[PDB]
Design an enzyme around this catalytic site. Structure first.
Site, PDB file in Angstrom:
ATOM      1  CE  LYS A 224      -1.624   0.587   4.063  1.00 51.30           C
ATOM      2  NZ  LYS A 224      -2.610  -0.005   5.010  1.00 51.30           N
TER       3      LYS A 224
ATOM      4  CE  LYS B 127      16.887  -6.358   5.730  1.00 49.70           C
ATOM      5  NZ  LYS B 127      17.680  -5.196   6.224  1.00 49.70           N
TER       6      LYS B 127
ATOM      7  CG  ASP C  90      18.375  -2.206   9.953  1.00 45.45           C
ATOM      8  OD1 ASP C  90      17.508  -2.690   9.194  1.00 45.45           O
ATOM      9  OD2 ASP C  90      18.451  -0.983  10.209  1.00 45.45           O
TER      10      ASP C  90
ATOM     11  CG  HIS D 126      24.086  -1.058   2.192  1.00 39.48           C
ATOM     12  ND1 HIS D 126      23.611  -1.297   0.920  1.00 39.48           N
ATOM     13  CD2 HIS D 126      24.434   0.251   2.222  1.00 39.48           C
ATOM     14  CE1 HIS D 126      23.685  -0.187   0.207  1.00 39.48           C
ATOM     15  NE2 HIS D 126      24.181   0.767   0.974  1.00 39.48           N
TER      16      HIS D 126
ATOM     17  CE  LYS E  17      18.377   2.347  11.824  1.00 40.52           C
ATOM     18  NZ  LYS E  17      17.620   2.754  10.605  1.00 40.52           N
TER      19      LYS E  17
HETATM   20  N1  LIG Z   1      13.520  -3.159   6.882  1.00 42.95           N
HETATM   21  C1  LIG Z   1      12.953  -4.336   6.619  1.00 42.95           C
HETATM   22  O1  LIG Z   1      13.540  -5.413   6.810  1.00 42.95           O
HETATM   23  C2  LIG Z   1      11.549  -4.339   6.076  1.00 42.95           C
HETATM   24  C3  LIG Z   1      10.725  -3.191   6.093  1.00 42.95           C
HETATM   25  C4  LIG Z   1       9.440  -3.277   5.573  1.00 42.95           C
HETATM   26  C5  LIG Z   1       8.970  -4.469   5.048  1.00 42.95           C
HETATM   27  N2  LIG Z   1       9.807  -5.577   5.048  1.00 42.95           N
HETATM   28  C6  LIG Z   1       9.339  -6.874   4.495  1.00 42.95           C
HETATM   29  O2  LIG Z   1       8.375  -6.577   3.518  1.00 42.95           O
HETATM   30  C7  LIG Z   1       7.363  -7.596   3.547  1.00 42.95           C
HETATM   31  C8  LIG Z   1       5.992  -6.917   3.485  1.00 42.95           C
HETATM   32  O3  LIG Z   1       5.426  -6.816   4.815  1.00 42.95           O
HETATM   33  P1  LIG Z   1       4.645  -5.501   5.297  1.00 42.95           P
HETATM   34  O4  LIG Z   1       5.409  -4.903   6.439  1.00 42.95           O
HETATM   35  O5  LIG Z   1       4.548  -4.573   4.135  1.00 42.95           O
HETATM   36  O6  LIG Z   1       3.177  -5.917   5.706  1.00 42.95           O
HETATM   37  P2  LIG Z   1       2.526  -7.256   6.340  1.00 42.95           P
HETATM   38  O7  LIG Z   1       1.311  -6.872   7.132  1.00 42.95           O
HETATM   39  O8  LIG Z   1       3.616  -7.872   7.138  1.00 42.95           O
HETATM   40  O9  LIG Z   1       2.090  -8.331   5.259  1.00 42.95           O
HETATM   41  C9  LIG Z   1       1.239  -7.988   4.234  1.00 42.95           C
HETATM   42  C10 LIG Z   1       0.184  -9.021   4.086  1.00 42.95           C
HETATM   43  O10 LIG Z   1       0.747 -10.259   4.576  1.00 42.95           O
HETATM   44  C11 LIG Z   1      -0.316 -11.096   4.991  1.00 42.95           C
HETATM   45  N3  LIG Z   1       0.108 -11.645   6.285  1.00 42.95           N
HETATM   46  C12 LIG Z   1       0.719 -10.956   7.364  1.00 42.95           C
HETATM   47  N4  LIG Z   1       1.004 -11.772   8.404  1.00 42.95           N
HETATM   48  C13 LIG Z   1       0.566 -13.042   7.979  1.00 42.95           C
HETATM   49  C14 LIG Z   1       0.567 -14.312   8.577  1.00 42.95           C
HETATM   50  N5  LIG Z   1       1.078 -14.498   9.844  1.00 42.95           N
HETATM   51  N6  LIG Z   1       0.063 -15.385   7.903  1.00 42.95           N
HETATM   52  C15 LIG Z   1      -0.415 -15.165   6.685  1.00 42.95           C
HETATM   53  N7  LIG Z   1      -0.486 -14.041   5.995  1.00 42.95           N
HETATM   54  C16 LIG Z   1       0.016 -12.975   6.666  1.00 42.95           C
HETATM   55  C17 LIG Z   1      -1.622 -10.203   5.030  1.00 42.95           C
HETATM   56  O11 LIG Z   1      -2.435 -10.446   3.872  1.00 42.95           O
HETATM   57  P3  LIG Z   1      -3.989 -10.651   4.051  1.00 42.95           P
HETATM   58  O12 LIG Z   1      -4.378 -10.632   5.503  1.00 42.95           O
HETATM   59  O13 LIG Z   1      -4.792  -9.665   3.217  1.00 42.95           O
HETATM   60  O14 LIG Z   1      -4.117 -12.068   3.514  1.00 42.95           O
HETATM   61  C18 LIG Z   1      -1.008  -8.806   5.027  1.00 42.95           C
HETATM   62  O15 LIG Z   1      -1.897  -7.838   4.456  1.00 42.95           O
HETATM   63  C19 LIG Z   1       7.641  -8.490   4.785  1.00 42.95           C
HETATM   64  O16 LIG Z   1       8.174  -9.709   4.395  1.00 42.95           O
HETATM   65  C20 LIG Z   1       8.647  -7.668   5.593  1.00 42.95           C
HETATM   66  O17 LIG Z   1       9.637  -8.439   6.196  1.00 42.95           O
HETATM   67  C21 LIG Z   1      11.064  -5.519   5.548  1.00 42.95           C
END
Ligand SMILES: NC(=O)c1ccc[n+]([C@@H]2O[C@H](COP(=O)([O-])OP(=O)(O)OC[C@H]3O[C@@H](n4cnc5c(N)ncnc54)[C@H](OP(=O)(O)O)[C@@H]3O)[C@@H](O)[C@H]2O)c1
Ligand SMILES: NC(=O)c1ccc[n+]([C@@H]2O[C@H](COP(=O)([O-])OP(=O)(O)OC[C@H]3O[C@@H](n4cnc5c(N)ncnc54)[C@H](OP(=O)(O)O)[C@@H]3O)[C@@H](O)[C@H]2O)c1
Lengths: 431, 431
Positions: free
Chosen positions: B17, B143, B230, B235, B332
């Site tokens: 989003k 990640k 991190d 990196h 940080k």
């Molecule tokens: N710095 C970093 O390392 C960093 C920063 C940001 C994001 N990320 C990665 O980016 C990815 C995106 O995650 P996000 O933070 O954007 O949002 P998110 O809420 O973690 O995941 C997005 C979608 O995942 C599904 N979901 C979440 N937990 C679940 C579970 N336990 N079992 C099944 N489905 C599940 C849901 O879909 P529905 O409920 O609609 O089915 C949710 O809308 C992740 O893998 C995260 O590690 C990493």
């Protein structure tokens, strides 16, 4: 040995009163001069040490806690009056130096704090009268080292007709306190990035000398020389040498100066199509000295076409550098106080902006220079052949400028300079 | 060919989003995506394209003059609801993609915008259902790529048990918009200064990642990983590779990644005596978020010894680099926002301060990364063996930190960090 006699030929003058005496005082105060050092002034005006002290101690930054070493310093001072072509006056000077404590055996350092017009006469008499029999004799000559190839050759041949080259110290110290540091870091950069600096990696080199201040009520002296003789021909050219030179045979002053001269002997004479000249005018919206231009200076003669900004393209012509343009850009009254050396690279990036390596910048330059003359390291002093090559490179252009008197391009106080200079940079390849 | 299907596995989520949808919208708006591109969201929550638009267009920076291309963009969008281990849901997704205009022949790009916990299941079903028969299939995994060597190996072996390495795209884009530019200029610097960068000229290399802001009400997520996982392990280590690597065989992604892995295979496992850990506390005299410390963050669990600053010394062990210390310093809530690579030189100056070469820093990093996945250049993406070597280097230290829970050194918000880190730098040789 241990005994040194610092002769100041022309001690009554401006450089001696405002700079030479204060700097040797600072060296003696900081325990940097040899313990057995005497200072002897020489001029025609009938003075005493008290008079020189009266007129010079304002520039000494004398604090009440160092007054004892100051009294000692002025105790080691003396003054001899006489003409500059009177044999009897030089005889009196020589006898007075021979009268100082173990002065016979002492090394003698002559600072020719005099208008170069008289150097000839002085260098003759000093040769036949005041030189030492045991200790070494070293001469410090000052700008201008001539104004073209012919005058500089006649003066340099006259001086190098009496003193060996290891006795001649051409000093240039008016471009700031970090000049020596500039040259040192540039030599270190050549020693490090030697293998990288070829025509294969580098497409263009620049050497920049910007100053944000104008002539400041003293454009009269600057008018007789020009920005090419003031900055480019001596300093920017020396650091061009330091950039383009080969690995010296050793760390001796003479080997690295041999490399600098080898670099100079490959630069052909610059021509006006590779040169952009500019003159600074008053800023209408600024304040202070920025409101006044170059011609608005009271000392500047009206109708002066003297360039206060120059952009010149040169080329070293050998196997290491060929077609690699060296752009020497200098100018008074600009936007910043910057002295840099930027080398632009041939990009090769495959992709489905040009990069450049940039070199910017305890004793001050002049202090370190005097202490070098004492030690005897001719590292930061130009040699006779080096000076001759620089004058050869820049003298046809200068003769043309004197003959045709081309009008320089007007640029505003605080600007970067003429846009035509940037056009000239674009012509040979830049950003 | 010309037809692309952008699947967003987990489109209802935060990354999709707030980032994924806006960035693909910006690429489509700027005409950077292929002309025949479709976007398909996939999650369990029963949504329509209107709902995703409602919740995501605030982040689009939509102006009233580009509303037509925006309508076209959302016309090329669709959404399919289903579970992540339901074979029938993946069958419905596959049939829906096969129904799009010439979707059969189309290249398919799967963005696994999902918690890694489910990746396994997803990567299985996508393998047996939704892959293309004609066009290429590329997976973008996110990640964390595990938290230690064992978890990362099990996940990487599972993923590299279904898709070839030229189909796996491990993306890291959270450390700023200039990450890709960092790596590009570092590769160019290695290609230029290759011959100079040896143990003979360089005495110490450093890689710095300072950020002047704290966790900012989101330390809860940072607590589960730490400053080593991190910033450093992914990196700073990649750019260490870029600095120390040999000349690649060509400009192929795989050859330069082979060189990076060859560099990693020469770094032995780091031990705690070469590591300094620090945690930031609230500044009493500052204002704003500087008043709050790390533990004062509501999301941070109390008693957390998680390091928010790390200084680690590593050594490449071959003939080109031996005993040359690579100091990775990141943290940080510091004094500046600086990302630099400084290489200190062996001085040789004969004289009767150490010098260093410093490397600082149209599409953003993430935008360029997505466009790279489209082109297929795996340049700025870590490989399986590269990731395995990094985890091997940093996992014994991390296991020790988890077991013994050593208390980090407190440093003040806005400070440079612990003084013990500078002591560690002095131990191996620095300024
Ligand atoms: N710095 C970093 O390392 C960093 C920063 C940001 C994001 N990320 C990665 O980016 C990815 C995106 O995650 P996000 O933070 O954007 O949002 P998110 O809420 O973690 O995941 C997005 C979608 O995942 C599904 N979901 C979440 N937990 C679940 C579970 N336990 N079992 C099944 N489905 C599940 C849901 O879909 P529905 O409920 O609609 O089915 C949710 O809308 C992740 O893998 C995260 O590690 C990493
Ligand atoms: N940027 C530069 O290029 C720059 C800047 C400053 C100085 N300098 C050089 O430094 C040297 C020192 O000069 P200065 O400016 O400090 O002061 P100066 O007044 O030029 O000369 C100092 C002494 O020279 C003697 N003198 C001057 N004109 C003479 C003449 N026509 N005939 C005989 N004796 C004469 C006088 O000694 P008495 O009357 O007591 O006998 C005077 O006190 C000069 O050679 C000058 O070129 C160069």
């Amino acid at each position: 040995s241990d005994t040194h006699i610092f002769i100041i030929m022309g001690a009554s003058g401006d450089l001696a009163k405002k700079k030479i005496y204060p700097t040797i005082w600072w060296l003696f105060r900081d325990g940097l001069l040899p313990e057995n050092t005497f200072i002897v002034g020489y001029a025609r005006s009938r003075l005493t040490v008290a008079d020189i002290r009266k007129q010079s101690e304002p520039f000494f930054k004398a604090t009440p806690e160092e007054k004892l070493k100051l009294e000692d310093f002025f105790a080691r001072n003396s003054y001899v009056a006489g003409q500059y072509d009177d044999a009897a006056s030089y005889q009196r000077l020589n006898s007075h130096m021979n009268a100082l404590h173990l002065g016979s055996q002492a090394n003698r350092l002559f600072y020719l704090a005099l208008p170069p017009t008289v150097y000839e006469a002085v260098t003759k008499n000093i040769h036949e009268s005041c030189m030492s029999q045991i200790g070494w004799n070293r001469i410090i000559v000052e700008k201008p080292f001539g104004r073209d190839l012919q005058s500089s050759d006649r003066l340099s041949n006259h001086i190098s007709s009496l003193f060996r080259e290891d006795q001649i110290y051409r000093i240039d110290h008016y471009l700031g306190k970090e000049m020596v540091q500039n040259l040192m870091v540039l030599r270190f950069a050549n020693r490090i990035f030697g293998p990288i600096w070829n025509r294969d990696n580098i497409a263009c080199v620049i050497l920049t000398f910007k100053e944000p201040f104008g002539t400041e009520g003293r454009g009269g002296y600057f008018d007789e020389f020009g920005i090419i003789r003031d900055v480019m021909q001596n300093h920017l050219l020396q650091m061009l040498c330091l950039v383009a030179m080969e690995k010296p045979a050793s760390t001796n002053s003479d080997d690295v100066r041999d490399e600098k001269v080898k670099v100079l002997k490959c630069i052909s004479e610059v021509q006006a199509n590779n040169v952009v000249l500019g003159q600074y005018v008053g800023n209408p919206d600024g304040e202070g000295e920025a409101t006044k231009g170059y011609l608005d200076d009271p000392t500047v003669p009206r109708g002066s076409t003297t360039a206060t900004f120059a952009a010149v393209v040169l080329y070293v012509e050998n196997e290491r550098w060929d077609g690699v343009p060296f752009i020497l850009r200098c100018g008074k009254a600009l936007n910043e106080r910057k002295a840099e050396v930027r080398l632009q690279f041939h990009d090769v990036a495959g992709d489905i902006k040009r990069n450049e390596l940039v070199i910017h910048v305890l004793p001050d330059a002049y202090e370190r220079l005097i202490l070098d003359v004492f030690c005897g390291s001719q590292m930061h002093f130009v040699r006779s052949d080096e000076l001759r090559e620089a004058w050869r490179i820049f003298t046809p252009l200068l003769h043309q400028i004197e003959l045709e008197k081309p009008k320089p391009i007007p640029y505003i106080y605080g600007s970067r300079g003429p846009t035509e200079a940037d056009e000239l940079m674009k012509r040979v390849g830049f950003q």
